[PDB]
Amino acid sequence: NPIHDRTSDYHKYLKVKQGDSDLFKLTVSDKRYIWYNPDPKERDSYECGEIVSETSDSFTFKTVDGQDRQVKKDDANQRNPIKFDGVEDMSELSYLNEPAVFHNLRVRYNQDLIYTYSGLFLVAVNPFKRIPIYTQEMVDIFKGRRRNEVAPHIFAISDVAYRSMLDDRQNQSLLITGESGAGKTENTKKVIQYLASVAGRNSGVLEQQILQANPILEAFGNAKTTRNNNASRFGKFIEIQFNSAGFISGASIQSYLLEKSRVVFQSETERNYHIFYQLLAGATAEEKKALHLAGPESFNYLNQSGCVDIKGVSDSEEFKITRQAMDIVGFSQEEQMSIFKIIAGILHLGNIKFEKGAGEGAVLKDKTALNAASTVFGVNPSVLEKALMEPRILAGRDLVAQHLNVEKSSSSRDALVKALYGRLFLWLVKKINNVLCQERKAYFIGVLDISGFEIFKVNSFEQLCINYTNEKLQQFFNHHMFKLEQEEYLKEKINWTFIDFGLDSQATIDLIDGRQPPGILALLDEQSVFPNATDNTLITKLHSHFSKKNAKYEEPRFSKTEFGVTHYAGQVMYEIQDWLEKNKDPLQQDLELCFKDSSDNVVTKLFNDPNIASRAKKGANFITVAAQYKEQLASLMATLETTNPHFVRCIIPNNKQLPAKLEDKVVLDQLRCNGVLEGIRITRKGFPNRIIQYRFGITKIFFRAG
């Protein structure tokens, strides 16, 4: 049994190494220790001091450099006896304080033990290197094991959810939180791997298709940002579906709004979506001539950020892997070829250069890029040129050809690019779901992988929606861990004094999405239909409603175009430029009419299939992106409320994507804003189990521990 064999790989990579006689000596020491700050300006930098004396209310301890200091017992962060260092479940610690919890994660992380329980939920600290704990042999070890029978692991919480699903006949979710780069997408994939394996299984083709969906989604929906070389730029909820017997019967991917803006613009050092680099690196021979391709430096949409490759990644090899996944999932050769024509066409569109005509209207003097795009998309270049520079609109009921200047023509060309790419992405997910989901499900385990909290030098509308999604997820953790839990204790009247755990994201949520008094998204929508609005009237309206009024909002003194939201994970300043256009998300109807006539069978579907190309109305206006965002988030939250949730908190070790480098302030900020210590305390002080060290409740008896 590998669990008990100290030579096994399980022991070697998932268990705390045996300590030596010198460590034994230290472990039976009668000395006692304290975690203190050498510099009180930096509360997160701790050293260990020996406690050398005490009074009824203070400790005196030695500092690393010697000099003795005193501290009130009520302010003291005592160090755990060292037999606790490496403990698998931190609810076992005697002293529950910040430096002690960090220390335990630190000891485990120093020996590549990245998973640790923190009471009821799992903490996963990103190793930023490969650790061989996800093999089939590891999978087989965890299969069917109760949590306290095996070491902490993403496989274990996955098995727990799978047995709860069987035993309780109840849908489950696995909610994996974390800032950008923390490990959500990798851990998501391990949960899927594990479930596909243990739920069977000779009848392996579906399981393979499920796994192969990922390189396709990542190639199109992930990109290098400053926070993650493989940042997810869309959120997803993956439903792994099981028949009533408990075997996997299918899967279905719910994808959320994609950051289409990245197709046309990337900040310094970032990349566009991986697929563009994969194509240009990995085509073939006649693909490059058939698609009129050259290198990334030759395309405006890839030559701006100064970064065309990612250390340790071969875009040409990844292209082979993406195509191989497209084959396995079932995309035809003609379908793959049309997918790449659309990628190539986008890049050609981005190389159109509009310039000033005799008058204010733009003209196109060099049509090389226009012609190449039109060739690959299968559209008429003269019709496309006219739809870009001279689109027709109604003015009242009259039909009037506009003549757009350079800036507007360029923006319209970008709008067409973003629509093509976002619609292609939706089409990819739809095609995948049609393959993966071929049976009605009895049960599901849903795994949520959102885009993680992020802060850049410039934060725009996309960042506010990403960070709001993260705030809402933290609140769902707070609701589950603290608020519902104490609501039960009351509904049962069990002698329980309510405890304020001081974690409540409600104020920030009402600021962003309040109705009600109206929050930020509601005012954005109101401005979006006001004929006379500008990004400046919008910011003025926000300040008017919130400045010196809402405690989570800040009107900054250093800028007239930004506002601050105090999120659970820190304040973010948001630049208002282009918000009304991003929210309206316009696309000239003459461009749509041009692409509806495409000779290409995939392009034609992107523009004629209503599930892909149609947009809902609200009154006399198309539904705004903020409204679409809210519908998606509301649908997710409604789904989660039907499941029994399991939480995995991914923690990034530093801001440099490096292994073996824990950064104290970075880690501790996450431990605080994630509510990890509060989560351990409720576990310890509360009454985790109730049917039908104790309380007799009105209709159940509640159990502690044990």
Ligand X SMILES: Nc1ncnc2c1ncn2[C@@H]1O[C@H](COP(=O)(O)OP(=O)(O)NP(=O)(O)O)[C@@H](O)[C@H]1O
Q: Which residues bind Mg ion (CB under 5 A)?
A: 184-185, 232
Q: Does 428 bind ligand BIT (CB under 6 A)?
A: no
**SS3 (DSSP) at 668:** helix
Q: Which stretch, 184-192, 208-216, 508-516, 593-601, contacts ligand X (CB under 6 A)?
A: 184-192
CA distances from 18 to 107, 125, 599 (A): 13, 22, 68
Question: CB nearest ligand X: which residue?
Answer: 452
178 is in an annotated binding site: yes
Burial class of 664 by CB neighbour count within 10 A (0 to 12, 13 to 18, 19+): middle
Q: Are 49 and 36 in contact (CB under 8 A)?
A: yes
642 is in an annotated binding site: no
Nearer to ligand BIT by Cβ, of 156 and 217: the residue is: 217
Q: Are 73 and 97 in contact (CB under 8 A)?
A: no
Q: What is the largest CA-CA distance in the chain?
A: 91
312 is in an annotated binding site: no
Q: How far apart are CA 153 and CA 140, in angstroms?
A: 13
Nearer to ligand X by Cβ, of 88 and 525: the residue is: 88
Nearer to ligand X by Cβ, of 527 and 670: the residue is: 670
**SS3 (DSSP) at 233:** coil
Q: Which stretch, 262-270, 292-300, 539-547, 628-636, contacts ligand BIT (CB under 6 A)?
A: 628-636
CA distances from 635 to 505, 640, 642 (A): 20, 9, 11
633 binds, among Mg ion, ligand X, ligand BIT, none (CB under 5 to 8 A by kind): ligand BIT
- Residue 218 C-beta: closest distance to ligand X, Å: 9
Q: Does 451 bind ligand BIT (CB under 6 A)?
A: yes
How many Å separate Cα 673 from the centre of its chain?
16
Q: Taking each helix axis from N to C terminus, what angle separates 381-389 and 406-436, rounded to the nearest 10 degrees? A: 120
| Tokens describing residue 674 | 């994630």
Q: How far apart are CA 76 and CA 673, in angstroms?
A: 21
Q: Quick one: which of 33, 128, 456, 703 contacts ligand X (CB under 6 A)?
A: 128
Looking up tokens 């930004």, which residue turns up? 562
Q: Quick one: which of 46, 155, 234, 273 contacts ligand BIT (CB under 6 A)?
A: 234
- Residue 182 C-beta: closest distance to ligand BIT, Å: 14
Q: Which stretch, 8-16, 406-414, 632-640, 689-697, contacts ligand BIT (CB under 6 A)?
A: 632-640
Query: Sign of torsion, CA 238 241 247 250?
Result: negative
204 is in an annotated binding site: no
DSSP state letters, 348-370:
HHHT---EE-SSSSEE-S--HHH
Binding mask 442-471 for ligand X (x = CB under 6 A): ---------xx-------------------
Q: Quick one: which of 230, 375, 380, 540 contacts ligand X (CB under 6 A)?
A: 230
Q: Does 465 bind ligand BIT (CB under 6 A)?
A: yes
Residue 444 phi, psi dihedral angles, 5° rounding: -145, 155
Q: Which stretch, 9-17, 206-214, 371-379, 458-466, contacts ligand BIT (CB under 6 A)?
A: 458-466
Q: Are 553 and 546 in contact (CB under 8 A)?
A: yes
184 is in an annotated binding site: yes
Residues that bind ligand BIT (CB under 6 A): 233-235, 256-257, 259, 450-451, 462, 465-466, 469, 625, 629, 632-633, 636
Annotation: binding site for ATP: 178-185
Residues that bind ligand X (CB under 6 A): 126-128, 130-131, 178, 180-186, 228, 230-232, 451-452, 650
